[PDB]
Design a protein around this ligand. Structure first.
Ligand SMILES: Cc1c(C(F)(F)F)nc2ccc(CCc3nc(-c4ccccc4)cn3C)nn12
Ligand SMILES: [Mg+2]
Ligand SMILES: [Zn+2]
Length: 313
């Protein structure tokens, strides 16, 4: 109870910034996550013993794939931590508890394959869940782990508070299905511009948390250029493996997933920053002004991919 987690000085200062990289020392990531829960939520939010046991079972249920791995989960949780810490008074106690857990869990038991590949393969998960296939799986894996003995980190919440936090987590994880993001951002755009956006309207909060989830999930475009650039290799190593698997089913993959078309990566990144990332952090900055460093960092990285195309790197 008087037992704080404390980080070395450079991490203690830099973890508060949006562009923080959690580093290559896997064994420090649990400690980084508890640090973040303690400062964004309180030392009283979770029993330390239960939280530590939950974090280690979550780690165990992330697979050894190039991108959608344990490092991604903790990276997405740190972005969320930075958003919550720069918007102190906008969020409920339940939201602060739910959203870091949501982020840590959002890609549980990912296999490095998209919803479309599961559908074309005719994976069982595609019959159990006809839309947001992997996302419904991730939430189902989260509930599983919460129900193992000694793993109920929400044990002190009431019956109705428990149901509310699990409902924040469910919508938060569903929102990481990027197919849902485009309509969610348009509605948020229209609502903000016509002045109807109302943070007391629960259906409006939901949308705003959805957009936070997209922003955290895409936060590898908001890092320093060398972090952004090396993560992109991990991202494409998954997509190219999926493309190989499409070719094995007798389907020409899209170019994004076809390793034979590596050369078009720079222009594919441009499209992605313009079509997805920039509009994401733009609408996010409109709704939550203190998240502007994410938009500024995203723009700097677009500018770096423009330099790659111009043969200046
Ligand atoms: C960085 C990043 C992130 C984030 F935010 F998580 F880092 N998420 C994603 C999701 C997708 C992509 C790939 C973006 C993309 N490449 C192509 C392409 C590439 C080579 C040849 C032909 C076409 C098309 N298109 C849309 N990057 N990405
Ligand atoms: Mg996902
Ligand atoms: Zn993710």
């Amino acid at each position: 109870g008087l037992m704080q987690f404390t980080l070395p000085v450079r991490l203690c200062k830099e973890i508060e910034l949006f562009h923080f990289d959690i580093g290559p020392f896997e064994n420090m990531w649990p400690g980084i996550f508890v640090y973040m829960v303690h400062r964004s939520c309180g030392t009283s939010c979770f029993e330390l013993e239960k939280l530590c046991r939950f974090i280690m079972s979550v780690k165990k249920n992330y697979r050894r794939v190039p991108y959608h791995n344990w490092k991604h989960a903790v990276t997405v949780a740190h972005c969320m931590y930075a958003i919550l810490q720069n918007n102190h008074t906008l969020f409920t106690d339940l939201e602060r508890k739910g959203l870091l857990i949501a982020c840590l869990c959002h890609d549980l038991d990912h296999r490095g394959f998209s919803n479309s590949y599961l559908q074309k393969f005719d994976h069982p998960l595609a019959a159990l869940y006809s839309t947001s296939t992997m996302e419904q799986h991730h939430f189902s894996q989260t509930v599983s782990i919460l129900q193992l003995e000694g793993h109920n980190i929400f044990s002190t919440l009431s019956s109705s508070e428990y149901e509310q936090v699990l409902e924040i987590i469910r919508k938060a994880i569903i929102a990481t299905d990027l197919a849902l993001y485009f309509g969610n951002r348009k509605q948020l755009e229209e609502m903000y511009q016509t002045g109807s956006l109302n943070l007391n309207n629960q259906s409006h909060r939901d949308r705003v948390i959805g957009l936070m989830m997209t922003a955290c999930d895409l936060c590898s475009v908001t890092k320093l250029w060398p972090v952004t650039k090396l993560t992109a290799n991990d991202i494409y190593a998954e997509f190219w493996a999926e493309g190989d698997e499409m070719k094995k089913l007798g389907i020409q993959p899209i170019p994004m997933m076809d390793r034979d078309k590596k050369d078009e990566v720079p222009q594919g990144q441009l499209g992605f920053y313009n079509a997805v990332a920039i509009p994401c952090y733009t609408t996010l900055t409109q709704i939550l002004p203190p998240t502007e460093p994410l938009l500024k960092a995203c723009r700097d990285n677009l500018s770096q991919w423009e330099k790659v195309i111009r043969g200046e790197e």
